């Protein structure tokens, strides 16, 4: 596979140097390029097992087998004397700049995946442009560079989650000896939002500075792929232009869905609006049962809010359903109200948002339960969390030939390639892939390395760990119990489980036998860990390390041999013994 | 090794049944034993690869090769018909009770290791006694069942640590929008102590109930091994008696050291006294630089205390010294004062503890710095944390023949056996072993299984993860950087590292570039992870999962391929790229 690898690498790399760590002529070229401020990829052949074979294969491209060999956009440009010739004649800058296209890479979308791909490509001398545009929500909310996670996703969600957790810290404080009057303590929504938004602002600015420092052209513009290599751009002044690029990365993400009911778009809000909302939501209805719905409902209740969640059928569809029930039970026990087996019919406005006192309006929500009984209740705020959708009709001309699935997501190969061979898709729009920030980032970085630095490594989308940041957090890595049983049969599945209690909860008088963990294992494969699940505080911190072990093919024996750290919650994974089949209670 | 294994198993097991899962005669015996309330170990031969060989070998003990075969204390007692014969004749209870000794196992020490070993042995029908006695501290402090971790160690330490962390949660709360008057908030030491001690009380009681429920004889008595099988006991009424046991487990732990200076024993306190201290310590001097010293100094400062730490030479000797410096730097930056290169000479009393108002006394501490300058300062409380020591002269007669090392710890084989073959040592007194609670527990449980259930599994003492619960926590698994370099040479070591910042610290306006992590790797062994180190909040929760991966022989590649969970602190381990040799700054 050496010949195939080199053919691909030479064809795709923007500026690449084939080198050896011990060669003085290679160092001379490296020093020249560094002085000339020419960024490039470097392949050290003496550090590869097939390095000798690569040298021989290079002759098919350069007619020489020696090092160094420099290539620019598919063409051999010279050995050490030749590169220094260009340098001494003021020709080098022009040569390493010659291109058929404006850019080696155009990234459409300045979110998690797009920024990661763009920055990484620039490192290897790919002339890169990143396009980002945020179409305003129906009520007019917009934000800066960084995409969903930075502005209206993971970052503000976790910060508001923390504000909520601090409510319970205030309660715990008394039991640990702290003297305070909780009856005189209140939360100010707008002060929290201002703090959150100040941090988001530093991230917006941070990414702009990063792109500048990486010599990436940032355009705050709407991009449209009109042919394989042509991107139509519309700027802030509505001026339309066309730029060209060799490789294109589609990383445009998704936006919240709205139910097709009267009043939904006019009066409801989504997560897009919530995180910069100038007024306190007040009495809130969340319509939906996604992790987004439950996370938002969760922190609103902890901030003292009157919160109701309207659930069509089940919670967290796709997630382990035992764990999902436990997540919901905790929320219900702590004041989140659930309108079960219930759907909305219409939203009517009873009061407009006060824009000078920053107070919410009032809405009438009409719906019905499956039993036929009517739902009719007043809420100050209605939040829709009924899923998210790609919007590639706004990004992609149909004549380009990029294939989309029934859901409107891009059908990709295992190296992120679309049906148009120079066009790639990463992040939430990549059909079938886990829709998470670190996945988008890994995909973008690994892709950029393959395109421009001769890397071979593909992104591994299997056993990607997750955490739902509900009031009691839920971390998971691998298969749900039901999926493992479906795949391998009940007779081949063993489940080890236990309740636990954080030491911190003892003095604080919190619940016994609520925090919970399980390992789903395959009996015939040396008790291989197929799935890990934990409900408890800091579940993300607990889960992460185990994801490495699971990647390596951890068995129950590996967990058993490892010694716990005491006192922690995570140590409970090291001493599990109660099986579900035994019928023994998991209580402690 | 089948013959050797069976010989050992038959010789050592108290009550054991050799069985097959498919055999109806085996089920009959199991049902008889369960009805008769006879606990026993069971070996299912059809579940072992060498099961057929074991059947043949059993004939050397029983003259039969069939299942079931029941053994009591080294003797074949019968097949299925024979066991049922004993049962129908009211003979079975007497037979399974026949013994040369009072107990199959006597555990001296009712702490982490001892309780774990005792409870586990009883499960397999070993007649077990657990002895525990707490010799009072010089000022008279004593406590209940459960040992060091439960009463004067991990448990109260972490709870007071949490009380300290809640101080900073109160600060963070304001930035997250919570309205409170911090100028009117104070901490009450005694209220905290009462809460902590209430939980310790439930653990004391919990362990007593557990021993009762496992049919373990608990004696609140001082034990002394006077011969291999004879233990002299002294009860609360000073009455002296002798009990006999087949196997003996020494699990007597350690107690705090005092420096040999005037006033030390009379006026100073240790961790033994601190966790139930009826008065607030007030202005405090901690003498020592162990994890105990720094943990205690740490939480006292967070509870608003005026705290000084006297350090002879370095912090956390034995731990990674870069990490140790970072731990100390954080503490110093947050108000813990350090008296560096300083030793104490004498403690003089200036005021006696007020026993009715629960207020501290006052002490004058005189010392000297290495530069010759005098140390003279008044403190309300002086705490010694200058190490811990075994006290086996109080437990062990010299004529028994149990070998101790220069430090007074028991020299053991890799299966915890002392130089007296029926006598074993576990926990802190086992020479050379990591002195941690889960280690003692694993050792005790695994030993009990080997002795009484035919297990082969040894305790793995390598790469045992740790966490120091200082104000900023420090988690580690594996080798320090300096130890890795010493072992393999600097040229074979690569260190990947990064600063990070908890998302929670952003809005709270806490430090950039203080939290830190590194992976110490071996270049020639596919970048094998030799050591993992993390400074940051919840470092124990972060570290634990990775300890499984390290046990399995994780490489840098395994970390790289694993996807992060966002937003967490732990995810930073999945994207490390900056090496120490490159000289690139780890700042973010
Ligand atoms: C409320 C919420 C909470 C979440 N929490 C987590 C979490 O805790 N952990 C986690 O891992 N994931 C979380 N996620 C998911 C995570 O946000 C996404 O997986 C990630 O942001 C996807 O990044 P992306 O690069 O694919 O697209 P995005 O981050 O959405 O970026 C795409 C960008 O491209 C822009 N764009 C669209 N069309 C064009 C165009 N025509 N021209 C130019 N620009 C365009 C978009 O406006 C956007 O700025 C959360 C999501 C939500 C909604
Ligand atoms: C302040 C402090 C904090 C710590 N924090 C942690 C931590 O966070 N995590 C961690 O893993 N480890 C921690 N440790 C260490 C941990 O406590 C010990 O490793 C563990 O308790 C050792 O248990 P053990 O069974 O060996 O002995 P112990 O728990 O000490 O139990 C021995 C018992 O035997 C009794 N005894 C002694 N002599 C006799 C006799 N002659 N007859 C009858 N009984 C006798 C003793 O009084 C004691 O009750 C901490 C230790 C200290 C001091
Ligand atoms: N004339 C060549 C010099 C090539 C050369 O002398 N390089 C040596 C390494 S120092 C080489 O490639 N030798 C053969 C090999 O390494 O296999 C140039 O200017 O680049
Ligand atoms: N007489 C024996 C019965 C032994 C017997 O029939 N057991 C069968 C299993 S059901 C057996 O050991 N067969 C030989 C084997 O399993 O290898 C007893 O009372 O224990
Ligand atoms: Ca274990
Ligand atoms: Ca990774």
mmCIF file of N, CA, C and O in Angstrom, chain A residues 520-552:
data_model
loop_
_atom_site.group_PDB
_atom_site.id
_atom_site.type_symbol
_atom_site.label_atom_id
_atom_site.label_comp_id
_atom_site.label_asym_id
_atom_site.label_seq_id
_atom_site.Cartn_x
_atom_site.Cartn_y
_atom_site.Cartn_z
ATOM 1 N N UNK A 520 -22.269 -3.369 31.196
ATOM 2 C CA UNK A 520 -22.915 -4.343 30.322
ATOM 3 C C UNK A 520 -21.803 -5.133 29.638
ATOM 4 O O UNK A 520 -20.964 -4.552 28.942
ATOM 5 N N UNK A 521 -21.783 -6.446 29.857
ATOM 6 C CA UNK A 521 -20.660 -7.277 29.409
ATOM 7 C C UNK A 521 -21.087 -8.456 28.537
ATOM 8 O O UNK A 521 -22.216 -8.928 28.641
ATOM 9 N N UNK A 522 -20.172 -8.925 27.687
ATOM 10 C CA UNK A 522 -20.431 -10.079 26.821
ATOM 11 C C UNK A 522 -19.745 -11.334 27.362
ATOM 12 O O UNK A 522 -18.516 -11.433 27.367
ATOM 13 N N UNK A 523 -20.559 -12.293 27.793
ATOM 14 C CA UNK A 523 -20.076 -13.498 28.470
ATOM 15 C C UNK A 523 -19.085 -14.314 27.635
ATOM 16 O O UNK A 523 -18.045 -14.730 28.144
ATOM 17 N N UNK A 524 -19.399 -14.511 26.354
ATOM 18 C CA UNK A 524 -18.588 -15.357 25.466
ATOM 19 C C UNK A 524 -17.272 -14.718 25.005
ATOM 20 O O UNK A 524 -16.412 -15.407 24.449
ATOM 21 N N UNK A 525 -17.119 -13.412 25.232
ATOM 22 C CA UNK A 525 -15.912 -12.687 24.840
ATOM 23 C C UNK A 525 -15.112 -12.237 26.074
ATOM 24 O O UNK A 525 -14.755 -11.061 26.208
ATOM 25 N N UNK A 526 -14.839 -13.192 26.965
ATOM 26 C CA UNK A 526 -14.093 -12.961 28.212
ATOM 27 C C UNK A 526 -14.655 -11.823 29.074
ATOM 28 O O UNK A 526 -13.897 -11.072 29.691
ATOM 29 N N UNK A 527 -15.984 -11.717 29.109
ATOM 30 C CA UNK A 527 -16.698 -10.641 29.818
ATOM 31 C C UNK A 527 -16.265 -9.234 29.357
ATOM 32 O O UNK A 527 -16.067 -8.323 30.175
ATOM 33 N N UNK A 528 -16.123 -9.076 28.038
ATOM 34 C CA UNK A 528 -15.802 -7.791 27.413
ATOM 35 C C UNK A 528 -16.810 -6.724 27.827
ATOM 36 O O UNK A 528 -18.016 -6.961 27.783
ATOM 37 N N UNK A 529 -16.319 -5.556 28.232
ATOM 38 C CA UNK A 529 -17.209 -4.442 28.562
ATOM 39 C C UNK A 529 -17.757 -3.828 27.269
ATOM 40 O O UNK A 529 -17.010 -3.238 26.484
ATOM 41 N N UNK A 530 -19.061 -3.993 27.054
ATOM 42 C CA UNK A 530 -19.737 -3.445 25.872
ATOM 43 C C UNK A 530 -20.315 -2.055 26.120
ATOM 44 O O UNK A 530 -20.444 -1.252 25.190
ATOM 45 N N UNK A 531 -20.681 -1.788 27.372
ATOM 46 C CA UNK A 531 -21.280 -0.510 27.748
ATOM 47 C C UNK A 531 -21.043 -0.173 29.208
ATOM 48 O O UNK A 531 -21.095 -1.048 30.078
ATOM 49 N N UNK A 532 -20.764 1.101 29.463
ATOM 50 C CA UNK A 532 -20.575 1.622 30.811
ATOM 51 C C UNK A 532 -21.556 2.775 31.010
ATOM 52 O O UNK A 532 -21.719 3.612 30.120
ATOM 53 N N UNK A 533 -22.210 2.805 32.171
ATOM 54 C CA UNK A 533 -23.261 3.784 32.458
ATOM 55 C C UNK A 533 -23.172 4.230 33.904
ATOM 56 O O UNK A 533 -23.039 3.400 34.803
ATOM 57 N N UNK A 534 -23.250 5.541 34.125
ATOM 58 C CA UNK A 534 -23.162 6.084 35.479
ATOM 59 C C UNK A 534 -24.072 7.293 35.649
ATOM 60 O O UNK A 534 -24.052 8.223 34.838
ATOM 61 N N UNK A 535 -24.883 7.244 36.699
ATOM 62 C CA UNK A 535 -25.715 8.362 37.097
ATOM 63 C C UNK A 535 -25.163 8.913 38.404
ATOM 64 O O UNK A 535 -25.080 8.193 39.404
ATOM 65 N N UNK A 536 -24.782 10.185 38.389
ATOM 66 C CA UNK A 536 -24.176 10.814 39.559
ATOM 67 C C UNK A 536 -23.486 12.126 39.238
ATOM 68 O O UNK A 536 -23.350 12.488 38.069
ATOM 69 N N UNK A 537 -23.055 12.859 40.281
ATOM 70 C CA UNK A 537 -22.345 14.124 40.072
ATOM 71 C C UNK A 537 -21.048 13.935 39.280
ATOM 72 O O UNK A 537 -20.396 12.893 39.403
ATOM 73 N N UNK A 538 -20.705 14.932 38.464
ATOM 74 C CA UNK A 538 -19.468 14.941 37.664
ATOM 75 C C UNK A 538 -19.281 13.671 36.827
ATOM 76 O O UNK A 538 -18.167 13.155 36.690
ATOM 77 N N UNK A 539 -20.389 13.179 36.270
ATOM 78 C CA UNK A 539 -20.408 11.915 35.528
ATOM 79 C C UNK A 539 -19.490 11.924 34.312
ATOM 80 O O UNK A 539 -18.971 10.876 33.919
ATOM 81 N N UNK A 540 -19.299 13.104 33.723
ATOM 82 C CA UNK A 540 -18.360 13.289 32.615
ATOM 83 C C UNK A 540 -16.920 13.039 33.023
ATOM 84 O O UNK A 540 -16.175 12.362 32.308
ATOM 85 N N UNK A 541 -16.533 13.573 34.182
ATOM 86 C CA UNK A 541 -15.189 13.355 34.724
ATOM 87 C C UNK A 541 -14.958 11.888 35.088
ATOM 88 O O UNK A 541 -13.860 11.358 34.890
ATOM 89 N N UNK A 542 -15.994 11.245 35.623
ATOM 90 C CA UNK A 542 -15.944 9.823 35.958
ATOM 91 C C UNK A 542 -15.749 8.987 34.687
ATOM 92 O O UNK A 542 -14.848 8.145 34.616
ATOM 93 N N UNK A 543 -16.585 9.249 33.686
ATOM 94 C CA UNK A 543 -16.669 8.414 32.485
ATOM 95 C C UNK A 543 -15.424 8.458 31.593
ATOM 96 O O UNK A 543 -14.997 7.420 31.075
ATOM 97 N N UNK A 544 -14.843 9.645 31.425
ATOM 98 C CA UNK A 544 -13.823 9.878 30.390
ATOM 99 C C UNK A 544 -12.681 8.856 30.359
ATOM 100 O O UNK A 544 -12.408 8.258 29.312
ATOM 101 N N UNK A 545 -12.024 8.664 31.500
ATOM 102 C CA UNK A 545 -10.894 7.736 31.601
ATOM 103 C C UNK A 545 -11.234 6.327 31.156
ATOM 104 O O UNK A 545 -10.439 5.672 30.472
ATOM 105 N N UNK A 546 -12.420 5.862 31.535
ATOM 106 C CA UNK A 546 -12.877 4.525 31.154
ATOM 107 C C UNK A 546 -13.048 4.350 29.645
ATOM 108 O O UNK A 546 -12.946 3.234 29.140
ATOM 109 N N UNK A 547 -13.314 5.449 28.935
ATOM 110 C CA UNK A 547 -13.460 5.406 27.478
ATOM 111 C C UNK A 547 -12.180 4.952 26.773
ATOM 112 O O UNK A 547 -12.245 4.331 25.713
ATOM 113 N N UNK A 548 -11.027 5.259 27.363
ATOM 114 C CA UNK A 548 -9.745 4.779 26.843
ATOM 115 C C UNK A 548 -9.646 3.263 27.024
ATOM 116 O O UNK A 548 -9.283 2.541 26.091
ATOM 117 N N UNK A 549 -9.977 2.791 28.225
ATOM 118 C CA UNK A 549 -9.959 1.359 28.536
ATOM 119 C C UNK A 549 -10.913 0.562 27.638
ATOM 120 O O UNK A 549 -10.550 -0.507 27.132
ATOM 121 N N UNK A 550 -12.118 1.094 27.429
ATOM 122 C CA UNK A 550 -13.100 0.466 26.540
ATOM 123 C C UNK A 550 -12.586 0.419 25.088
ATOM 124 O O UNK A 550 -12.730 -0.603 24.410
ATOM 125 N N UNK A 551 -11.975 1.515 24.630
ATOM 126 C CA UNK A 551 -11.335 1.564 23.306
ATOM 127 C C UNK A 551 -10.306 0.436 23.138
ATOM 128 O O UNK A 551 -10.189 -0.164 22.060
ATOM 129 N N UNK A 552 -9.583 0.150 24.217
ATOM 130 C CA UNK A 552 -8.554 -0.890 24.236
ATOM 131 C C UNK A 552 -9.118 -2.303 24.414
ATOM 132 O O UNK A 552 -8.368 -3.283 24.383
#
